């Protein structure tokens, strides 16, 4: 038998993380 095959190539980049959460409420209107 021959030598062991070379290491497999590095895996692909991971998928993007979860979408961010909704922002903070606006600046309360003037009374």
């Amino acid at each position: 038998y021959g030598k062991p095959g070379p290491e497999g190539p590095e895996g692909p980049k991971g998928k993007p993380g979860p979408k961010g959460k909704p922002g903070k409420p606006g600046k309360p209107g003037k009374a």
Binding site: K3, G5, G11, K15, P18, K24, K27, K30
Partner: protein, 32 residues
């Protein structure tokens, strides 16, 4: 003493990224 074995499998896909940034603040409120 033959040829080299086949290349290993491709590695796992990387971890998921971090959560996205918070969204922009909401619009200012209406005057009373």
């Amino acid at each position: 003493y033959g040829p080299d074995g086949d290349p290993g499998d491709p590695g796992d896909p990387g971890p998921d990224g971090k959560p996205g940034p918070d969204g922009p603040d909401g619009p200012d409120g209406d005057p009373g």
